[PDB]
Amino acid sequence: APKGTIYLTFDDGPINASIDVINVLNEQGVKGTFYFNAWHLDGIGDENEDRALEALKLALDTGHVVANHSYAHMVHNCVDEFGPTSGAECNATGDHQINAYQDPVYDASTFADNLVVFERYLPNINSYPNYFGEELARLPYTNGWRITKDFKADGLCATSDDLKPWEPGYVCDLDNPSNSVKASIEVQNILANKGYQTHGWDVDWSPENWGIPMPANSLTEAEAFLGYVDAALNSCAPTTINPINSKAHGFPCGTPLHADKVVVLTHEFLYEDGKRGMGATQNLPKLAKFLRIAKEAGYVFDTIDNYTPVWQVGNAYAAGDYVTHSGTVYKAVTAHIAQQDWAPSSTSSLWTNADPATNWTLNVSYEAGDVVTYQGLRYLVNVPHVSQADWTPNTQNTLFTAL
Ligand SMILES: CC(=O)N[C@@H]1[C@@H](O)[C@H](O[C@@H]2O[C@H](CO)[C@@H](O[C@@H]3O[C@H](CO)[C@@H](O)[C@H](O)[C@H]3NC(C)=O)[C@H](O)[C@H]2N)[C@@H](CO)O[C@H]1O
Ligand SMILES: [Zn+2]
């Protein structure tokens, strides 16, 4: 038996430093989840990205999961007209989390255009089992969560309308949050309706002190960081974390799917000797040590696509157990042994659809007070039922009422 499961996640690649992080993981057989922005493939990301596409292939060919972090990390929302140099301009002012989300519908279509750009550089990318770019996402700067119908969170302080949190006068206020944070929540609901899950994080391997001249140099030591991981296990880390920017407000603490797991967040550019410090010189052995000793401490590493386990012939499932089957979440209705001829489906009596989306869907267990969207209209659930073809919201005056 294992102590728990760590999910190593790496934001904001593929950059030339993705290559070196991958080789450290590959030396120890650990596989990681990589949330990628494809503008590094167009070389407009203002980093070292000569080998970005080489990095993307190395990740896929050595079995790491690739996931959708949007095309340009919402840098169009920081400049006034997004173009080649926008990545460089926005690094001058450092106004990244300021007005990070504005038009939710445009911002969300940035995840769509991400996929179009990947498939253009790696035209055979859909043939990799590891490519989850259509199904797994993470919002820039936001500790947001869309996991199941009953497992969602939101980062209510992750972005700002005016000031940075280290500037005098920054007041957060979860009761009326920033228009940027409001926009970020709409983006998640849009992605959820497209069939995505989104994962935030339990722990952040990041600078303890971003203000420092070389902020990559202040990365937590591995031994100490194993301490933050042991700290975070079953302790509902996303609400207790610091700063209040990276908090996941509304995290369903105690939820069963999160038990015995820790999602670690890091950035590849923290592992590069360069503009942010001695990243490779100081932190690549940090990461190597963390794998050796976290294994010793009793952990097993995995990738986010298994956080929600895949339905498997031969496993015993209990009522209320969550699985994934074709990138769609289901909750067991009936304890049973899963056999090949009754996998989850839109008509299974053994399973109900539990995707965190909000359009009306077949085989969902609706509670009263739920709202669904159907043929462009919003209906409210008057009576708890499991939906089926005959009960479309626009024909069942009893079950649904139009808003
Ligand atoms: C500690 C704190 O006050 N806030 C934490 C955030 O720092 C952090 O979110 C991360 O912020 C980074 C700084 O903005 C940001 O890096 C930027 O990313 C873009 C895209 O790669 C680059 O163009 C910028 O150069 C880069 N900025 C810098 C200074 O390197 C990260 O993308 C973003 N995730 C989160 C997670 O650590 O936690 C907050 O609490
Ligand atoms: Zn990011």
UniProtKB/TrEMBL annotation:
<dbReference type="InterPro" id="IPR050248">
    <property type="entry name" value="Polysacc_deacetylase_ArnD"/>
</dbReference>
<feature type="disulfide bond">
    <location>
        <begin position="236"/>
        <end position="253"/>
    </location>
</feature>
<dbReference type="InterPro" id="IPR036573">
    <property type="entry name" value="CBM_sf_5/12"/>
</dbReference>
<dbReference type="InterPro" id="IPR002509">
    <property type="entry name" value="NODB_dom"/>
</dbReference>
<keyword id="KW-0732">Signal</keyword>
<feature type="binding site">
    <location>
        <position position="69"/>
    </location>
    <ligand>
        <name>Zn(2+)</name>
    </ligand>
</feature>
<feature type="binding site">
    <location>
        <position position="327"/>
    </location>
    <ligand>
        <name>Mg(2+) 1</name>
    </ligand>
</feature>
<keyword id="KW-0106">Calcium</keyword>
<dbReference type="Pfam" id="PF02839">
    <property type="entry name" value="CBM_5_12"/>
</dbReference>
<protein>
    <recommendedName>
        <fullName>NodB homology domain-containing protein</fullName>
    </recommendedName>
</protein>
<feature type="binding site">
    <location>
        <position position="135"/>
    </location>
    <ligand>
        <name>Mg(2+) 1</name>
    </ligand>
</feature>
<dbReference type="GO" id="GO:0004553">
    <property type="term" value="F:hydrolase activity, hydrolyzing O-glycosyl compounds"/>
</dbReference>
<feature type="binding site">
    <location>
        <position position="194"/>
    </location>
    <ligand>
        <name>Ca(2+)</name>
    </ligand>
</feature>
<keyword id="KW-0862">Zinc</keyword>
<feature type="binding site">
    <location>
        <position position="12"/>
    </location>
    <ligand>
        <name>Zn(2+)</name>
    </ligand>
</feature>
<dbReference type="Pfam" id="PF01522">
    <property type="entry name" value="Polysacc_deac_1"/>
</dbReference>
<dbReference type="GO" id="GO:0005576">
    <property type="term" value="C:extracellular region"/>
</dbReference>
<feature type="binding site">
    <location>
        <position position="159"/>
    </location>
    <ligand>
        <name>Mg(2+) 2</name>
    </ligand>
</feature>
<dbReference type="GO" id="GO:0016810">
    <property type="term" value="F:hydrolase activity, acting on carbon-nitrogen (but not peptide) bonds"/>
</dbReference>
<feature type="disulfide bond">
    <location>
        <begin position="78"/>
        <end position="90"/>
    </location>
</feature>
<feature type="binding site">
    <location>
        <position position="11"/>
    </location>
    <ligand>
        <name>Zn(2+)</name>
    </ligand>
</feature>
<dbReference type="InterPro" id="IPR011330">
    <property type="entry name" value="Glyco_hydro/deAcase_b/a-brl"/>
</dbReference>
<feature type="disulfide bond">
    <location>
        <begin position="157"/>
        <end position="172"/>
    </location>
</feature>
<feature type="domain" description="NodB homology">
    <location>
        <begin position="4"/>
        <end position="302"/>
    </location>
</feature>
<dbReference type="GO" id="GO:0030246">
    <property type="term" value="F:carbohydrate binding"/>
</dbReference>
<dbReference type="GO" id="GO:0005975">
    <property type="term" value="P:carbohydrate metabolic process"/>
</dbReference>
<keyword id="KW-0479">Metal-binding</keyword>
<dbReference type="InterPro" id="IPR003610">
    <property type="entry name" value="CBM5/12"/>
</dbReference>
<dbReference type="GO" id="GO:0046872">
    <property type="term" value="F:metal ion binding"/>
</dbReference>
<keyword id="KW-0378">Hydrolase</keyword>
<feature type="binding site">
    <location>
        <position position="73"/>
    </location>
    <ligand>
        <name>Zn(2+)</name>
    </ligand>
</feature>
<feature type="binding site">
    <location>
        <position position="195"/>
    </location>
    <ligand>
        <name>Mg(2+) 1</name>
    </ligand>
</feature>
